From a paper:
[name]/3 complex is composed of seven protein subunits and nucleates the formation of [name] filament branches on the sides of preexisting “mother” [name] filaments. Elongation of these branched [name] filament networks powers eukaryotic cell and organelle movements. Like [name], [name]/3 complex is an ATPase. ATP hydrolysis and release of the γ-phosphate from [name] and/or [name] regulate the turnover and mechanical stability of branched filament networks.
Author numbering:
A (entry chain O), F (entry chain Q): 6 to 375
B (entry chain F): 1 to 168
C (entry chain D): 1 to 219, 221 to 317
D (entry chain A): 2 to 39, 66 to 427
E (entry chain G): 2 to 152
C-alpha cells in the first residue's frame, strides 16, 4: 500500500491507494488562539489543525497555509501533514510511499519544498507528485477528455488525447471556492448581515455549500428572484438567529461564468474550457468536446453541469455533440484517481525513491514527476 | 501475424490443449517428493508419447507430456545469420526472465530455440486456456518481433554511416 | 559517444595533471590503444622528466614513407633515443615546460595525438605529391592522364597497419584515393559487419551527404591494388574505397581529414559493439510486452496491503 | 593464449578502478556512475560515465549508480558503462586481451552469468577471470611480487563504498566456509553524515558534501559516550567546513558529533541497520574462530585492511584493540580453567601504502603470473558451454 | 567418487513398454508380407484416380513394432502419398464416415508424417489435421498421446 | 500465389496475384507522437504506420517516406514493408515471391536498395520490379498505347507499341497529387482557412478528393465562379466547423495543366503527353493517339478525361482520332495490372530468384527488369 495525500487548498483529502474513497477529509486550516488564556491547565494547545480547529473557531484566527494551490506558509503546512499522517490516518509515514498532487503551472520551488519536506521531515520511503487534472481523468474511467478541476483556490483545464497531454493548451485560472466565499461575504453585506472574521468566513462557506446553486439563465433568474418568493430561503446560525437570502444564492456561483463580478479580467469557466479545446490540434477537438470532465468541490453546485453544457454548446459549432461528465463523487475525483494510479503495477517503477533523492537532491522531482 | 501460420498453430493449439491434462503426482522412485515426471523420465508408464508438430525443416514444435507435467520446445524461423544471432540472444532475455513467466525453462532442450515446462501447479493456479493462448500468441508474434529488430539494426547501421561520412 | 576521439585520452589527462601539478610524483605506465598499438609513459631519471614512448608493428613501413621528418617537425627539441622495446620516444621536462595554459593545453594534446601523428606520414606524402601533380596537370591537360597512370603505380603507399587490414593510398592530380582492405575475424562481428559496411555504401548514394568523399565497396579489389602484397581477393575481406577530392583536403580540412580517415575501421568496430548494447535494450522491451500476454493467465486476486519494506500492514 | 597485458577492472559501488596488469597505479579511478536521458533512436549513445558524468547533472541527464551493495543490479547501465570504459578510456580491443573483473564473495551466480555473456557476446573478449575482490587485496600487502616477500596467510578486511567483507585466506587458499559479509560501508556512512547535516538543517546536505566531510573531518574514537562528553569540554572539535553549492556560491557547515559517530557505523552497525547487528571486531573474531584451528595464530598475526572506507583516522588501532580485547579475554578464560599460563596470540591489523585500491593492485600483481591465461574462462570454453561456465562459485564449497 | 555410480538400474529393474502395451503376436516377416501386399493397392488407387478408396484400403491394416522400421517407413510413405492425392473438398465426406478406430489410425500417422518434414510435405498433413480434429473432436488427439510408442 | 505491391508514393496497394483488386490499401505514412504521455497503463507505442497513424493523427507528426516516387527515408519504408507483410496481408515474406512496382527514370540506387532489402532483410524467395506504367497496359488489356500515370508523388508517360516500349520517348514529371495538396493548402489561405500541420495536410488531401474537379476551360470557369455561388461547395472539418470553397475547387487540379501555378517550368500533362507521342516513331503515333490510357489516383478528378481529350485534340493533327481510355477502376490499375502480370504462365521464368541474386549482388535487377 501507498498513501494518497491530495493536500488541496481548502480540504486535505487523504487515505490509502486502492481504498474506495478518502478516509481523512478535513479543512486545510491551522488555527491559533487570539484571546487571554486565563484558566491554567485545561488541556490548552498553542495551535489546532483541521476539524480540531474548525470546531474551536470562535476563539481562533483560522488561516490556510496554502493559497491558490501554492504553499504560502511551510511551518503550518508541515503541521497539516503531521496531523494527516499521525492523527488522522494514524500511520508512520516512514513506512509508506506518498502520492502527492499539485495543480499545473505552479512555481518550481513549491514542488521542490514539497518533496524535500516529505523526504527530510516525514522521512517517507518513496514519493510522487501527480498533476491534479491528470488524476481526475483516471477517476472518470477515460484516457481522453478535458478535465475542468476546480477546488477552493484554483480552477484549471488539462486536455488529454490517447493519454498524451497537450501542455501548450493547459489553462489555469486563480478563481475557485474561496473567491466565491469572499464574494458571498461582499454580497451578504448588502442584505443586512455582516461577516468579517476568519471564523465567520467558515459560516458563509457553510451557507455557500448548501443554499447556493447555478442558474441555467442568469438574466431571467435575476428577474424571477426580483418578483417572487420561491427563490428565497433561510439558514440558522450558530447564534440561533436566521439568515434569509434570495438572488445572492445564484449571483455567488455566477462569478465562475462571469469573473468580472470580483474585478477579474478573464474568460469564465465555460469560455476557458473552449479556449483550451480550441488550442488543441484540429483532429482531437471532437473527442475533447464529447468528454469534458467536471472535478473538485467548486463543481458541486446544483445545475452547473446543465449550465456548463448550455454555455459550451453556444461557443462550440452546432454540428457536433457536447457532453459534460459530472459524477456524484466528483467531490473527491482527484483523490479517487490518485488511488487508482498509486495501485497500477507500472506506477511502482515511477516513484522518486529515498536513495535516489539522497543522491540526486530535491531537483529530482523536475526530471521524474513530469 | 497469422494467415501463413494458421494451419500450423491450429495443429499446435489442438495438440497442446489435448496434452495439458495434468494432475498431482507423488514420485514413485523417491518418497515424500513430487517431481515433474516429463523432465526426470525415470518411470516410463506415466510418460505419454512425444509428438512433433511441424511446418517446415526449420519451424517445429516438440510436445512431451506426463501425468503431472508437459514440456514444449520450439524451433523458430532463422533464415540468415542476422536472425540466428537476433533469435539466439532474444531467447536468452526471454528465458533470463523465467522466474516471472512461470511456465518457461531457463535452458532449451538440445537443438531447440526456446522451451516451456507447464507443470501441474501452473494448471491449478493459472488459467490453462490462457497458457495455450500465450504459447500460440508468442509463436505468431516472435517472427514479427525479430524481423523488426533487423530493421532497427539497419537503421543504426545508417545512423553511424551518415554521422561518420558527413564530417569530411 | 557517437564517434571516437582521435587522441589517446589517458596521455591527455595525465599530461594535463602533470602540467598543472605543483609537485609531480613518479610513474611507470604501459597503455594499450587500437590497431595493436601500445604506449609506455614513465619517469626514468627524475619525477621531473616524462618519457612517452610508442610501439606499433608497422612503424618500419611508416619510416619508409618519411615519418621521422614529420615527427622531428612536430616534437622538435623533445625527441629522444627510442626506448628499448619501443619504436619512437619523446622526453618532456616539467621544469623546462612552455609558459601559458593554452601552450600547456596544446602540448598535452599534441603528445596524446602521437598515434595519429606517426600514422599521418603516408597521407602527407600523398597530399603534398597531389599538390605537385595538380600543378603539372595544369601545365599540360593531355599529359595529365599519363602522370596519373604512372603515379597510380609508382607513388602508391601500402601500410599493413594491423594483421587483418591494409590501408592502400595513392595521389592523382585531383584526388587521393584510399582503400581499406578490411576484415572482421570475430564471427558475430563479421555477421553485423556485412550490414555495417553495406549500409555505409548505400548511405553515400543519398542527396543529404553528396558533399562527402566518394565511397565504393567490393568483395574483388580495385584494379590498381590487385598485385599489392597481403591483398588477396578470396579470403572474405571487403575493400572499402574512399576517393578524397581536392575539396576534402583543402588546407583548413587536411588535419581533420587525416585524423578522421585513420579512425574509419575503428568506428565500425566500436559501433558493431555498441549495436549489441542497442539490440539488447530493444529485446528486453519486447520481453516486457510478452509479460502482458502471460499476465492474463494469472487469476485476479488482491495481494494483501504491505508497508514499503514488504512487512504486513493493518489499515483500509 | 594472447601475450598482451591483461586488463584489470575493479568496478566498485563507489569507484571503478581501471588499468593494465603490471602498472604502478590504476589508469583511472572514477565514480561507478552513468549519466542518461530522463528521427533515429540514439538515447543509448548519448550517455557519459565517471568524472565526465558528474559534469552532466546540470545539463539535464539523470545520474544512476549501476552497482549497489557491491553487486551489479542494472545490466543495461553496466553494459554501457563497460563499453564506454573499454572503447573511450582504456581504448583497447577486447579480442586481444584477457580481462580481470572483480565481485564480492556473496554475489549471486546470475551476476557472474550476466557478466560472462556481456563480456563474451557483446565485447567478444579473449578470456575472463572474475576474481573475489578481497582475495586479491591480500596481494597488495606484499613488499614485492617476488616469492620471498609473500605472506600467503592472513585475514583480509575489505570495506569499500557499498560492501564490507572479511575473507580469511591461509597458505594461499581461501577458507570459503568462514567468509563474513555486511552490506554497510562508505555510502551508508555517507547517508548517515548527510542525515545528521539535514537534522541540524545546515545550508547544504548534498551527497558530495557528506562524501567530502567523511574523508576531510571524520575519525574513529575509542568510545562515543566519552567522545560526546569531550565535544562539550573541548569546543575546538566542532570544525567549520566551507562547501560550494551545486549552483556556484559559498556556504559554511558546522560539523559536529558526526566527526566520530559516523565512522562508528562499523563498530556499532545497529546505528545503520536493524538486520546487521554484529560489529566489525566481533565479525572478525567470528571469522577467525570459525576457521580451522592450526591457521588461527596466522590469521590473527596478519589482518590486512583494504578498500577506501578503512582509511578513517584511527580505524586500524580501534579494530586492533577491540579484537585484542575479545581475543585475550577468551584466552584468559582458558588460562583460568587450566591454572597454567599461555604464550597468548599477537594480533596485528595492517594498514599499508596501497590500502586505498588494494583489490586493483592485487589483481594487477596476480595477472602478471605466466599461469594466469589458464585460470581465465577462454572464449573457446564460452563457445562450447555458454555463459553457465561462470555460474559455479570458485570460493564456497559446492555440492556436485 | 561414489555419489555418481547408479545402482537403481542394476538392483530395481524398471518396467518396459511391452509390460504396459501387449507385445505384437504377428512375426516380423508375417507383417512385412501383410504390408507389402497392401502398398500396391494404395499405389494403384492413385494411378486410377480413386485415391480415397486407396486410403480406405491402406488404413485396413497398420504395422507396429521396434522390429519393423524398414516397413513402417514404407507404410508411412504410401500414407503421406495417398493424403497428398485426395482433394481438400472430399476430406469432410471421408472423415465423417470413418470409424473412431480408423480416425485414430489417420491422426496417429499424420503425427508421424509431421515428425519428418525433410521427407514429407507438412502443408497437406496440417490441412488433414485441422479437418480430422474439427469433425471428430479433440479426444482423437488424446488417443494419439496415449497410443502405443512403437506405432 | 505471388504477392504484388504497388508501393505508391502516397497509398500502399498490396495483395496476391489473381485477385481482382488490392487486399490492403492504406496511406504510405509513418507517424511518431509529438506530445508527452501522462497516462500510465495506456499502450504507448513509439511509431504508428498506415491506417493507425492516419486514425491517431491529432497527436502525431506524420512523414511520408517516399518523395516523388523515390524512397527517401529507408527506415520508415522498412516499417511500411513490415506492416504490409506481418500486419496487413499477415503472411510471412519468405513464403511468396513478390512483384514490386517502380516509376520510370528513378535513381538506379532506389531499385538496387529495394532489391537488397527484400533479399537480405525480408529474405523473400524471388522478386521483380516492374515499371508502373507498363502494368497499366496489362490492366487496360492493351499491347499498344501511351500510358498517362499520375499518383501522389509522380506523373509519367510510357509509350508502348505491340509490347515494345520506347524508352527514349518516356516523359516524367515530379508533379502529382502531393503538390496539389501543397498548393490547395496555400490557396485555401486566400479565403482565410489556415492549414499548416502534417495532420491538417490530411484534411486538405480529403477536401481535394471530395470536392475538386478539372474545369473544361479555365478562363471561362473562372469568369463563371467570379459572378456566382453556384460552383461553391462546403466541407465539415473533423472539428465540426464548415469551410466553404470557391474557384480554388478547380484552380487546384489546373496545376496539372499549368505547372507555372506552383512556380515550376514544365509542360502540363497535355503537352507532356503530346511531346511523348511526337518523340515516338511517325508510324506508331496514329495508334498512340487512339489508345491513350490513364492511371493513378490524380487522374480521378471529374472532367479530367474531357479536359485531356480537348487539349490533345487542340495539339494533335485534326485529321485523326484522339481517344482516351480512362477506365472506372483506374485508381488501382497499376496493382490490377501487376496482379495479371504476376499470374501469367510466361512470367514465372522472369523473377529474380534468391539463388540468382546472391551470385550477382543487387546489380542483377538492371539486367532482368526494364
Ligand atoms: N456542495 C457544494 N456546493 C458548493 N461548493 C462546494 C460544495 N462542496 C464543496 N464545495 C466547495 O469546494 C471547495 C473544496 O473543494 P476541493 O475540491 O476539496 O478543493 P481543494 O482540492 O482545493 O481543497 C470549498 O470551497 C467548498 O466550499
Ligand atoms: N580518507 C578516507 N577516509 C574515509 N573514507 C574514505 C577516505 N578516502 C576515501 N574514502 C571512501 O572510500 C570509499 C571508496 O572506496 P573504494 O575502495 O573505492 O570503494 P568501492 O570499491 O566499493 O567503490 C568511498 O566511500 C570514499 O568516500
Ligand atoms: N477520387 C480522387 N479524386 C481526386 N484525387 C484523388 C482521388 N482518389 C485519390 N486521389 C489522390 O491520388 C493520390 C493517390 O493516388 P495513387 O494512385 O494511389 O498514388 P500513388 O500510387 O503514387 O501512391 C493522392 O494524392 C490522393 O489524394
Ligand atoms: F487547491 Be484546491 F484544488 F483549489
Ligand atoms: F563496492 Be565497494 F567495493 F564497496
Ligand atoms: F506511386 Be504513385 F503513383 F507515385
Ligand atoms: Mg483541489
Ligand atoms: Mg571495492
Ligand atoms: Mg503509384
Amino acid at each position: 500500500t501507498a498513501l494518497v495525500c491530495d493536500n488541496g487548498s481548502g480540504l486535505v483529502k487523504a487515505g490509502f491507494a486502492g481504498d474506495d474513497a478518502p478516509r481523512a477529509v478535513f479543512p486545510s486550516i491551522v488555527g491559533r488562539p487570539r484571546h487571554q488564556g486565563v484558566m491554567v491547565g485545561m488541556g490548552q494547545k498553542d495551535s489546532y489543525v483541521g476539524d480540531e480547529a474548525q470546531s474551536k473557531r470562535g476563539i481562533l484566527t483560522l488561516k490556510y497555509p496554502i493559497e491558490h494551490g501554492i504553499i504560502t506558509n511551510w511551518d503550518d503546512m508541515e503541521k497539516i501533514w503531521h496531523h494527516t499522517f499521525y492523527n488522522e490516518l494514524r500511520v508512520a509515514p516512514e513506512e509508506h510511499p506518498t502520492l502527492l498532487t499539485e495543480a499545473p503551472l505552479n512555481p518550481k520551488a513549491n514542488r521542490e519544498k514539497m518533496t524535500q519536506i516529505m523526504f527530510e521531515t516525514f522521512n517517507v520511503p518513496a514519493m510522487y507528485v501527480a498533476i491534479q487534472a491528470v488524476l481526475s481523468l483516471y477517476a472518470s474511467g477515460r484516457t481522453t477528455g478535458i478535465v475542468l478541476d476546480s477546488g477552493d483556490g484554483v480552477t484549471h483545464n488539462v486536455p488529454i488525447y490517447e493519454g498524451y497531454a497537450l501542455p501548450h493548451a493547459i489553462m489555469r485560472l486563480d478563481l475557485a471556492g474561496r473567491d466565491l466565499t469572499d464574494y458571498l461575504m461582499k454580497i451578504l453585506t448588502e442584505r443586512g448581515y455582516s461577516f468579517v472574521t476568519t471564523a465567520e468566513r467558515e459560516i458563509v462557506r457553510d451557507i455557500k455549500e448548501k443554499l447556493c446553486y447555478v442558474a441555467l439563465d442568469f438574466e431571467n433568474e435575476m428577474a424571477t428572484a426580483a418578483s417572487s418568493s420561491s427563490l428565497e430561503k433561510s439558514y440558522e446560525l450558530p447564534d440561533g438567529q436566521v439568515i434569509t437570502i434570495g438572488n445572492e444564492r445564484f449571483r455567488c456561483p455566477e462569478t465562475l461564468f462571469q469573473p468580472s463580478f470580483i474585478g477579474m479580467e478573464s474568460a469564465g469557466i465555460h469560455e476557458t474550457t473552449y479556449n483550451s479545446i480550441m488550442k488543441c490540434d484540429i483532429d482531437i477537438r471532437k473527442d475533447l468536446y464529447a468528454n469534458n470532465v467536471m472535478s473538485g468541490g467548486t463543481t458541486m453546485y446544483p445545475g452547473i453541469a446543465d449550465r456548463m453544457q448550455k454555455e459550451i454548446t453556444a461557443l462550440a459549432p452546432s454540428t457536433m455533440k457536447i457532453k459534460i461528465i459530472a459524477p456524484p463523487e466528483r467531490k473527491y475525483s482527484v483523490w479517487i484517481g490518485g488511488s487508482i494510479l498509486a495501485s497500477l503495477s507500472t506506477f511502482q517503477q515511477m516513484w522518486i525513491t529515498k536513495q535516489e533523492y539522497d543522491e540526486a537532491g530535491p531537483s529530482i522531482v523536475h526530471r521524474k514527476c513530469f | 501475424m497469422s494467415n501463413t501460420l494458421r494451419p500450423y498453430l491450429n495443429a499446435v493449439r489442438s495438440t497442446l490443449t489435448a496434452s495439458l491434462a495434468l494432475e498431482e503426482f507423488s514420485s514413485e522412485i523417491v518418497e515424500r517428493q513430487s517431481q515433474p515426471e516429463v523432465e526426470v523420465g525415470r518411470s516410463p508408464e506415466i510418460l505419454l508419447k512425444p509428438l512433433v508438430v511441424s511446418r517446415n525443416e526449420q519451424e517445429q514444435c516438440l510436445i512431451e507430456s506426463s501425468v503431472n507435467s508437459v514440456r514444449f520446445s520450439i524451433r523458430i524461423k532463422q533464415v540468415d545469420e542476422i536472425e540466428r544471432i537476433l533469435v539466439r540472444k532474444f531467447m536468452q532475455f526471454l528465458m533470463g526472465r523465467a522466474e516471472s513467466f512461470f511456465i518457461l525453462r531457463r535452458k532449451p532442450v538440445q537443438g531447440y530455440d526456446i522451451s516451456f515446462l507447464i507443470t501441474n501447479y501452473h494448471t491449478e493456479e493459472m488459467l490453462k486456456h490462457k497458457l495455450v493462448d500465450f504459447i500460440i500468441e508468442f509463436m505468431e508474434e516472435v517472427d514479427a518481433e525479430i524481423s523488426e529488430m533487423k530493421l532497427f539494426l539497419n537503421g543504426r547501421a545508417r545512423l553511424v554511416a551518415e554521422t561518420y561520412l558527413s564530417c569530411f | 559517444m557517437l564517434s571516437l576521439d582521435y587522441n589517446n585520452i589517458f596521455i591527455y589527462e595525465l599530461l594535463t595533471e602533470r602540467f598543472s601539478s605543483e609537485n609531480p610524483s613518479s610513474i611507470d605506465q604501459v597503455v594499450t590503444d587500437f590497431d595493436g598499438v601500445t604506449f609506455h609513459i614513465s619517469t626514468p631519471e627524475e619525477k621531473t622528466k616524462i618519457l612517452i614512448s610508442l610501439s606499433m608493428k608497422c612503424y618500419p613501413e611508416l619510416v619508409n614513407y618519411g615519418t621521422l621528418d614529420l615527427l622531428k617537425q612536430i616534437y622538435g627539441a623533445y625527441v629522444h633515443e627510442p626506448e628499448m622495446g619501443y619504436n619512437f620516444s619523446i622526453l618532456i621536462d616539467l621544469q623546462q615546460l612552455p609558459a601559458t595554459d593554452e601552450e600547456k593545453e596544446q602540448l598535452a594534446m599534441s603528445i596524446s595525438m602521437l598515434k595519429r601523428n606517426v600514422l599521418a606520414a603516408p597521407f602527407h606524402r600523398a597530399f603534398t605529391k597531389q599538390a605537385e601533380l595538380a600543378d603539372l596537370a595544369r601545365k599540360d591537360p593531355e599529359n595529365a592522364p599519363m602522370l596519373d597512370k604512372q603515379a597510380t603505380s609508382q607513388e602508391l603507399m601500402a601500410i599493413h597497419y594491423r594483421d587483418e587490414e591494409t590501408i592502400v593510398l595513392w595521389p592523382e592530380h585531383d584526388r587521393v584515393t584510399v582503400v581499406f582492405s578490411t576484415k572482421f575475424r570475430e564471427e558475430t562481428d563479421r555477421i553485423f559487419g556485412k550490414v555495417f559496411l553495406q549500409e555505409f555504401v548505400d548511405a553515400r548514394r543519398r542527396p543529404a551527404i553528396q558533399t562527402a568523399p566518394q565511397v565504393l565497396f567490393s568483395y574483388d579489389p580495385p584494379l590498381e591494388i590487385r598485385d599489392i602484397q597481403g591483398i588477396q581477393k578470396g579470403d572474405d575481406f571487403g575493400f572499402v574505397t574512399f576517393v578524397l577530392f581536392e575539396r576534402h583536403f583543402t588546407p583548413q580540412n587536411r588535419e581533420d581529414c587525416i585524423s578522421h580517415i585513420q579512425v574509419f575501421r575503428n568506428t565500425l568496430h566500436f559501433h558493431i559493439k555498441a549495436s549489441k548494447a542497442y539490440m539488447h535494450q530493444r529485446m528486453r522491451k519486447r520481453v516486457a510486452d510478452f509479460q502482458k500476454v502471460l499476465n492474463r493467465a494469472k487469476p485476479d486476486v488482491e495481494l494483501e496491503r504491505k508497508t514499503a519494506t514488504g512487512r504486513s500492514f493493518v489499515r483500509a | 593464449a594472447s601475450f598482451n597485458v591483461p586488463i584489470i577492472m575493479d568496478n566498485g559501488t563507489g569507484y571503478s578502478k581501471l588499468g593494465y596488469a603490471g602498472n604502478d597505479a590504476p589508469s583511472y579511478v572514477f565514480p561507478t556512475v552513468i549519466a542518461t536521458r530522463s528521427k533515429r533512436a540514439t538515447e543509448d549513445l548519448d550517455f557519459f560515465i565517471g568524472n565526465d558524468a558528474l559534469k552532466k547533472a546540470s545539463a539535464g541527464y539523470s545520474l544512476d549508480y549501476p552497482i549497489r551493495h557491491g553487486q551489479i543490479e542494472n545490466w543495461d547501465h553496466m553494459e554501457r558503462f563497460w563499453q564506454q570504459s573499454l572503447f573511450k578510456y582504456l581504448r583497447c580491443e577486447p579480442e586481444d586481451h584477457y580481462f580481470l573483473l572483480t565481485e564480492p564473495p556473496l554475489n549471486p551466480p546470475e551476476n557472474r552469468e550476466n557478466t560472462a555473456e556481456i563480456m563474451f557476446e557483446s565485447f567478444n573478449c579473449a578470456g575472463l577471470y572474475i576474481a573475489v575482490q578481497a582475495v586479491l587485496a591480500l596481494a597488495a600487502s606484499w613488499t614485492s611480487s617476488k616469492v620471498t616477500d609473500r605472506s600467503l596467510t592472513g585475514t583480509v578486511v575489505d570495506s569499500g563504498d557499498g560492501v564490507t567483507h572479511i575473507i580469511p585466506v591461509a597458505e594461499g587458499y581461501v577458507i570459503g566456509s568462514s567468509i563474513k559479509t555486511m552490506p554497510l560501508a562508505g555510502r551508508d556512512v555517507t547517508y548517515f553524515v548527510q542525515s545528521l547535516l539535514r537534522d541540524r538543517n545546515e545550508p547544504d546536505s548534498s551527497l558530495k558534501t557528506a562524501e567530502r566531510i567523511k574523508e576531510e573531518c571524520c575519525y574513529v574514537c575509542p568510545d562515543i559516550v566519552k567522545e560526546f562528553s569531550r565535544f562539550d569540554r573541548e569546543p575546538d572539535r566542532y570544525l567549520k567546513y566551507a562547501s560550494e553549492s551545486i549552483t556556484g556560491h559559498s556556504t559554511t557547515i558546522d560539523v559536529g558529533f558526526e566527526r566520530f559517530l559516523a565512522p562508528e557505523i562499523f563498530f556499532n552497525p545497529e546505528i545503520a541497520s536493524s538486520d546487521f547487528l554484529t560489529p566489525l571486531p566481533e565479525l572478525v573474531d567470528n571469522v577467525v574462530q570459525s576457521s580451522p584451528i592450526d591457521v588461527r595464530k596466522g590469521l590473527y598475526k596478519n589482518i590486512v585492511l583494504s578498500g577506501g572506507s578503512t582509511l578513517f583516522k584511527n580505524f586500524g588501532n580501534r579494530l586492533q584493540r577491540d579484537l585484542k580485547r575479545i581475543v585475550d579475554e577468551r584466552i584468559h578464560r582458558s588460562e583460568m580453567l587450566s591454572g597454567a599460563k599461555s604464550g597468548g596470540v599477537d594480533v596485528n591489523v595492517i594498514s599499508h601504502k596501497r590500502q586505498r585500491n588494494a583489490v586493483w593492485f592485487g589483481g594487477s600483481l596476480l595477472a602478471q603470473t605466466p599461469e594466469f591465461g589458464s585460470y581465465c574462462h577462454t572464449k573457446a570454453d564460452y563457445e562450447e558451454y555458454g555463459a553457465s561456465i561462470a555460474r559455479r562459485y570458485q570460493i564456497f564449497g559446492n555440492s556436485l | 567418487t561414489f555419489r555418481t555410480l547408479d545402482v537403481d538400474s542394476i538392483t530395481e529393474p524398471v518396467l518396459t513398454e511391452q509390460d504396459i502395451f501387449p507385445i505384437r503376436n504377428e512375426t516380423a516377416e508375417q507383417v512385412q508380407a501383410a504390408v507389402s501386399q497392401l502398398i500396391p493397392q494404395a499405389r494403384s488407387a492413385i494411378q486410377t484416380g480413386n485415391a480415397l478408396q486407396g486410403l480406405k484400403t491402406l488404413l485396413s491394416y497398420v504395422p507396429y513394432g521396434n522390429d519393423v522400421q524398414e516397413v513402417r517407413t514404407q507404410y508411412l510413405n504410401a500414407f503421406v502419398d495417398v493424403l497428398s492425392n485426395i482433394r481438400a473438398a472430399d476430406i469432410p465426406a471421408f472423415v465423417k464416415e470413418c470409424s473412431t478406430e480408423e480416425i485414430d489410425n489417420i491422426v496417429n500417422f499424420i503425427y508421424r508424417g509431421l515428425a519428418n518434414p525433410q521427407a514429407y510435405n507438412s502443408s497437406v498433413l496440417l490441412n488433414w489435421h485441422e479437418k480430422v480434429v474439427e469433425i471428430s473432436g479433440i479426444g482423437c488427439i488424446v488417443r494419439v498421446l496415449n497410443s502405443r510408442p512403437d506405432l
